[PDB]
Amino acid sequence: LMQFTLPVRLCKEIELFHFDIGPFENMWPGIFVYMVHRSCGTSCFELEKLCRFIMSVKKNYRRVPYHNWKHAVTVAHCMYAILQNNHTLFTDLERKGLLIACLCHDLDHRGFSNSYLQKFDHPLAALYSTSTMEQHHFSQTVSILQLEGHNIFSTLSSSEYEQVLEIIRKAIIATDLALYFGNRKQLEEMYQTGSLNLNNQSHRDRVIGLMMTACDLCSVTKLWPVTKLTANDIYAEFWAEGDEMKKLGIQPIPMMDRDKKDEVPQGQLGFYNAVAIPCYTTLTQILPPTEPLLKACRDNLSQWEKVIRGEE
Ligand SMILES: Cc1ncc(C)n2nc(CCc3nc(N4CC[C@H](C)C4)nn3C)nc12
Ligand SMILES: [Mg+2]
Ligand SMILES: [Zn+2]
Known part of the structure; x- marks a missing residue:
């Protein structure tokens, strides 16, 4: 049968947490199928259906500087790394659902925060009062799944199917960074009071929620030049939103004010x-x-410290 193989350097490096998917867009689909076949199996999905889902998911990411297709696949590779290093902690459905959740997690992002839709009075802010974009992303994921030839989950039973869509829904919501702070606090307390229980479904949920934040933030766990250059795309969006904020007659937060360019190093410090x-x-x-992600984050914090001290 028909597996994807990658060139040697990509075959070795894709297993590492700090892998960069590279600038060749045409390989990102095959990099993703490679990652499902190894983390899940060549039997998880019909290859015709998966390839068609992938291309429709791609079609529905926008040509924005950060929240684009490259981001989607980058966030799926980091999930792949996590699943492959924690082999037997995850259910067959979780392995299926989480790489799809990552690919789909920013579907149809416009390059604007939930807060800018709320102040623009975008329609989506009326349909979805909290986690506005994240609820749109799940909804968009469900639309693509219902297209002719795109139900990659067709082989699953009714309640297996309901389970995987519920995993994908929670996983996507959890990428609302406004929800991260409280999720991590409850996780940190449960871990230290030793009462953290991976058989408790609402514990797994929080743990998947943190994995989602971790994959979403993985720009900070890369080789420093990847981190430095992703930072430029992140701020290009924020500052464009800042411009849009000023058009409504609202002073953007410092994070989104391009007049405060020079304070970026200190902003990154606060963020790490x-x-x-x-x-x-x-x-x-x-x-x-997952220690290598913490190690690489620490490394990149030290690189921003060096930028402030004028050593970089
Ligand atoms: C790397 C990364 N990944 C994901 C996300 C969501 N973010 N958000 C940032 C923005 C970081 C930030 N910059 C600032 N500064 C800019 C200078 C101004 C004074 C305020 N304040 N904050 C908090 N970086 C990332
Ligand atoms: Mg998002
Ligand atoms: Zn994202």
């Missing part, structure tokens, strides 16, 4: 300290083999 380091710290406690 307030957000990224705690995420990989907690996730490494809960899943020991």
